[PDB]
Design brief:
This is part of a larger assembly, with 9 copies of chain A.
Chain A: H1 14-30
The complex binds a molecule of 2 linked components (NAG-NAG) (6 copies) and 2-acetamido-2-deoxy-beta-D-glucopyranose (8 copies).
Chain lengths: 36, 86, 370, 244, 99, 49, 50, 34, 50
């Protein structure tokens, strides 16, 4: 923000990305491939 | 950029040959589009036909096979798709 | 043509685009309104008395036909300076709202009368807009506007609080607080009358005598034209690609009896991006519509210069009814065909169907057996 | 030949909503079935409109004047700065015959009016008219709702007008009606205030049913829609709401 | 048959192309610093020694606009070619055999 | 390109509509970024534990 | 004559801005290709044996 | 309402959680029930 | 002192050697100005936009 530049935040926060990775990993440990 | 004027053309010709490559790029684009369609669809060498009598074990393909009644020679789903989008 | 446009002495089998073709126009038409009466310019120039710069005289001129040749060819004017137009083109333009501002100035300040200028009278008496279009006329008046005893009826303002907006006249003759000392209606000290006269005497040399100056200001295409030059109208012809000049509007195309309806106050019509689609003729008051005469692109089909020299010519997106680059050789009796891509000359259609070499379009494609 | 009065009439000026009235054709260019965005001086949507049941009102940029008139009691208009002989003034009158427009240095007294005799023969609006510059005559301008728009731009006095059949009692109709240009005048005055003229029944004046609506103009950007016949049917004011 | 807006991608492609053409056409109405946006008028209003300057301004503006349009077209064409290549792979693999 | 100057804005006004398409392109890529991330990661319908 | 210098500055800055935008477009296309590959890999190798 | 994306007016914030309809940013988005 | 610009002025703790007059950080943007009279170090922030 100096003379017209603007940086917009990403829609998905880092916490949500962590939640998706955790969900994928916990699914593939327990279910295998059947959950896909 | 000239609208059929001689003075504009005379002043333009001293800018070099921009328009040659300007037309070349568009021609390349058009040829690429034709090649795209050809390679996507023309995957076969012949033109097969379905038999007149259709008993596919109970499966019903009438919604997908072309309708000879319609002059467009397109099936129902294809007509829906063509009508929906401009 | 393809050899020349491709810069080779050999061409391979295929289709190449060479150039474009247009229908040439004929029988140029000029159509101007019927109003014809001599326009009163002499009395403005030949006026006995002019006004001071702070009270410059303005006259509005409309509904007349003007001859600027008498003004241009006369050498009595020392300075004849036009900004937005050429002096020789003034006899071919139609426009409204002529403004004539006349006054008399000092000889040395004549070059302050120009857009984007700074001076004494330039910012306190008469300021022109930066985008001013028109002409300025300056000519000496030593024999008339100068007196041996010195005339002092010509005034100018030297003191003012601020500058002037373009095309503005101020006649407020009030004492000015030149210094920090208030005037309160009395000059005293640090207060002076803004206006003072000119010491015009024939004793002074060049660059000192009074100069009569008049500026003509115009407008360009913002109303139904009211003032026009000395030009002769003609008749109109329809359904032919012609050059036309309707009331200073120049164009080229075919004119047709339009179907759209105009309310009684429009003059023309357009759809997108300055495309004048309809026009009302100034004399007959009949609506017409304009569409440019046909044009298109041309391409060739050749089987390769190593095999033969016969070629076929395709005019893209053009109805085969009218076709005749001149190339009348392919306009006399050669075989013709019409497809959704355009008109084809030199190739014959055959009911037999099989794979082709040189694609044309819309499922039609050609090859060499003829 | 004008005298003062004792019945000090005081018009009960109320307020009303502007709704979506006061849209005119801005240029002389035909357009069909197109959405065109233009910036000009207009009457903003949903503004206050003053209702008068003859005070000197300021002109500002321009004026929208409306009247749900019956029998056409309103006759004329006065425009100027001081409305005296010291400054140029504009006068408009519309009797049973062709209108009369004059630009002169009149001498206006306290209560200008036409006057009717019962066959009318009466005209005592002003007292003197010494210097005259411009004159004009054309067709008469005038249950029914009559709308006029007065603008003064670039030394040009533009007057636009429209007439509509209406049947509602008091409030301005909730509808759309474009205003076709009526006349342009190439005369330059520095008008800042205006008035109104009444043809009181002089036989004791009886002019009480004199109602008119006044609104003012501001510069802004509008979006206009032209249908196939070239008639303006819808408009959108840009600077009114986020949706707009 | 009932629900619309299920063909967003194709409609977006069509809209992008149409909008590009529309803005290219509308670019013809700008002065680019000259005195008028119509060329016949300035040809028919003043002397060539400065008509050349005005035409220079118009020419450079329109050249810039045309170059921008061509570059945008090239980028879009590359993207569409990538999509078509993927579609060809999909038809070859899933239609002509089990994947 | 103007830094809050009136005359600069007036001069720029006659250059057409370059800025509209510039902002359009930037917005397009900005939206594409979020679409990209969501396509890559959002492969599941629930949140297993 | 100040308008001439203003015009020169305007055209220079505009050209620089256009160059920046074009570079951004190219880079975005490249990144999109990479992310498409990443999505394919995550679908084919994480959710199943390849 | 004040959020990381910016300042939001005309809409009320709630403690529920639904799917995303009109993305706003920083992990929040809005919808029509007001 | 001839350096013109628009912003909001706050107090700053940066230290100038006795011969500078104003500072900048990178990309050539002014950030701190020493006022001619009181010889104190101020800080410049562009007032908000969006
Ligand atoms: C496949 O499905 C279609 C769609 O329902 C069937 O067509 C219908 O057939 C019945 C009986 O012949 C008619 O009453 C309907 O009017 C038909 N619908 C339409 C849209 O044409 C078709 O019969 C099915 N295939 C077979 C072999 O029965
Ligand atoms: C002002 O009046 C003089 C004379 O009255 C005009 O002089 C004319 O000059 C032309 C060219 O030399 C002659 O052909 C005419 O015969 C002259 N007029 C007369 C009446 O003899 C002069 O043109 C007038 N000024 C303007 C602007 O028209
Ligand atoms: C070329 O022009 C001719 C003459 O108008 C067209 O022939 C007419 O076509 C219309 C349909 O488009 C028919 O209704 C008429 O009966 C035809 N003959 C006439 C008017 O005499 C021809 O169609 C045009 N070519 C193309 C490709 O449009
Ligand atoms: C019309 O206007 C002229 C021009 O102002 C008037 O003539 C002036 O009248 C005043 C009144 O005392 C004098 O001081 C001026 O010397 C007159 N001449 C000028 C050039 O201003 C005139 O009185 C007005 N009325 C009529 C009927 O002519
Ligand atoms: C636009 O103009 C046309 C041309 O007059 C109008 O069409 C007429 O409308 C009236 C009223 O419905 C009908 O009685 C006429 O028969 C119509 N003319 C024709 C030739 O059919 C039309 O109403 C106008 N307005 C719109 C919105 O189209
Ligand atoms: C310039 O600024 C003012 C102008 O008069 C003066 O500064 C003050 O001077 C008095 C007299 O010694 C001191 O008591 C104040 O503390 C000074 N104020 C500040 C803010 O320094 C002086 O003429 C000049 N000051 C400097 C620092 O150059
Ligand atoms: C010009 O002459 C024609 C034919 O005499 C006439 O119809 C037309 O009305 C005249 N022009 C005007 C403006 O009256
Ligand atoms: C032309 O074609 C013949 C037959 O294919 C070949 O022998 C000859 O070399 C070719 N000539 C050229 C110039 O291509
Ligand atoms: C096929 O040949 C016949 C000749 O009798 C002709 O009339 C017909 O138009 C041809 N078909 C096509 C599609 O050209
Ligand atoms: C006096 O003025 C009022 C206000 O207009 C009016 O209603 C009333 O009729 C008038 N009376 C007479 C006798 O003129
Ligand atoms: C304007 O309209 C408002 C809203 O009804 C009203 O309260 C007010 O009295 C009107 N007049 C003025 C001068 O605000
Ligand atoms: C009033 O009508 C008469 C009838 O000819 C005529 O003087 C003119 O049209 C009108 N007069 C004024 C001053 O409006
Ligand atoms: C209302 O105006 C219309 C046309 O403007 C006209 O025909 C009608 O007679 C008027 N009604 C009255 C009562 O004057
Ligand atoms: C939402 O919940 C938080 C904590 O549970 C609380 O502080 C806040 O007031 C709640 N807001 C609403 C609108 O319920």
């Amino acid at each position: 923000k100096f003379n017209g530049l603007t940086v917009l935040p990403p829609l998905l926060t880092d916490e949500m990305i962590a939640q998706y990775t955790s969900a994928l990993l916990a699914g593939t440990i327990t279910s295998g491939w059947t959950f896909g | 950029i000239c609208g059929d004027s001689t003075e504009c053309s005379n002043l333009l010709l001293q800018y070099g040959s921009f328009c040659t490559q300007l037309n070349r790029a568009l021609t390349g684009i058009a040829v690429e589009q034709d090649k795209n369609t050809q390679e996507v669809f023309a995957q076969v060498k012949q033109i097969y036909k379905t038999p007149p009598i259709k008993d596919f074990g109970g499966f019903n393909f009438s919604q997908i096979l072309p309708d000879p009644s319609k002059p467009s020679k397109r099936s129902f789903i294809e007509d829906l798709l063509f009508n929906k989008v401009t | 043509e393809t050899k020349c446009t491709l810069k080779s002495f050999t061409v391979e089998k295929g289709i190449y685009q060479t150039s474009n073709f247009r229908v040439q126009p004929t029988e140029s038409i000029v159509r101007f309104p019927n109003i014809t009466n001599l326009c009163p310019f002499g009395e403005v120039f030949n006026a006995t008395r002019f006004a001071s710069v702070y009270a410059w005289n303005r006259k509005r001129i409309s509904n007349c036909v003007a001859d600027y040749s008498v003004l241009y060819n006369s050498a009595s004017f020392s300075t004849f300076k036009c900004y937005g137009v050429s002096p020789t083109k003034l006899n071919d333009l139609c426009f409204t709202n002529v403004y004539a501002d006349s006054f008399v100035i000092r000889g040395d300040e004549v070059r302050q009368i120009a857009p984007g200028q700074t001076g004494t009278i330039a910012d306190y008496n008469y300021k022109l807009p930066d985008d001013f279009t028109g002409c300025v006329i300056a000519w000496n008046s030593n024999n008339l506007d100068s007196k041996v005893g010195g005339n002092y009826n010509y005034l100018y303002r030297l003191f003012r609080k601020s500058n002037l907006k373009p095309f503005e006249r101020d006649i407020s003759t009030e004492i000015y607080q030149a210094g920090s000392t208030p005037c309160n209606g009395v000059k005293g000290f640090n207060c002076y009358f803004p206006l003072q006269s000119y010491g015009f005497q024939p004793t002074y040399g060049v660059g000192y005598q009074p100069y009569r100056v008049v500026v003509l200001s115009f407008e360009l295409l913002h109303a139904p034209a009211t003032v026009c030059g000395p030009k002769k109208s003609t008749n109109l012809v329809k359904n032919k690609c012609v050059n036309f000049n309707f009331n200073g509007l120049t164009g080229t195309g075919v004119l047709t009896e339009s179907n759209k309806k105009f309310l009684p106050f429009q003059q023309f019509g357009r759809d997108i991006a300055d495309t004048t689609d309809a026009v009302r003729d100034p004399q007959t008051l009949e609506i017409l519509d304009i569409t440019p005469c046909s044009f298109g692109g041309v391409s060739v089909i050749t089987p390769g210069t190593n095999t033969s020299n016969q070629v076929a010519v395709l005019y893209q997106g053009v109805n085969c009814t009218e076709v005749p680059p001149t190339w009348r050789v392919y306009s006399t009796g050669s075989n013709v065909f019409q497809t959704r891509a355009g008109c084809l000359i030199g190739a014959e259609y055959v009911n037999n169907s099989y794979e082709c070499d040189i694609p044309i379009g819309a499922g039609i494609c050609a090859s060499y057996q003829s | 030949q004008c005298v003062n009065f004792t019945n000090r009439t005081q018009l009960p000026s109320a307020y009303t909503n502007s709704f979506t009235r006061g849209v005119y054709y801005p240029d002389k260019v035909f357009r069909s079935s197109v959405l065109h965005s233009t910036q000009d001086l207009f009457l903003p949507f949903f503004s206050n409109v003053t209702w008068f049941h003859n005070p000197v009102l300021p002109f500002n940029d321009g004026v929208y004047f409306a009247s749900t008139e019956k029998s056409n009691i309103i006759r004329g208009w006065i425009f100027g700065t001081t409305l005296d002989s010291k400054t140029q003034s504009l006068l408009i009158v519309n009797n049973a015959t062709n209108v009369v427009i004059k630009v002169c240095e009149f001498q206006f007294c306290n209560y200008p009016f036409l006057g009717v005799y019962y066959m009318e023969s009466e005209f005592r609006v002003y007292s003197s008219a010494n210097n005259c510059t411009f004159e004009y005559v054309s067709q008469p301008f005038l249950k029914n709702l009559s709308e006029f728009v007065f603008k003064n731009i670039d030394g040009y006095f533009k007057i636009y007008s429209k007439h509509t059949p209406i049947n509602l009692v008091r409030d301005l109709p909730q509808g759309f009606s474009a205003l076709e240009p009526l006349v342009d005048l190439p005369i330059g005055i520095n008008i800042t205030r205006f008035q109104t003229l009444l043809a009181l029944h002089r036989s004791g004046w009886t002019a009480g049913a004199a109602a008119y609506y006044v609104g003012y103009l501001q510069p802004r950007t509008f979006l206009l829609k032209y249908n196939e016949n070239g008639t303006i049917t819808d408009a959108v004011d840009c600077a009114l709401d986020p949706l707009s | 048959s009932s629900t619309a807006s299920a063909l967003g991608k194709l409609q977006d492609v069509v809209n992008q192309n149409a909008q590009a053409l529309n803005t290219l056409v509308k670019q013809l109405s700008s002065n680019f610093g000259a005195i008028s946006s119509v060329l016949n008028d300035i040809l028919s209003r003043l002397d060539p020694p400065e008509a050349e300057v005005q035409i220079d301004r118009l020419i450079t503006g329109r050249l810039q606009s045309l170059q921008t349009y061509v570059t945008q077209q090239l980028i879009r064409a590359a993207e569409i070619r990538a999509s078509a290549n993927l579609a060809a792979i999909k038809m070859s693999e899933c239609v002509l055999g089990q994947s």
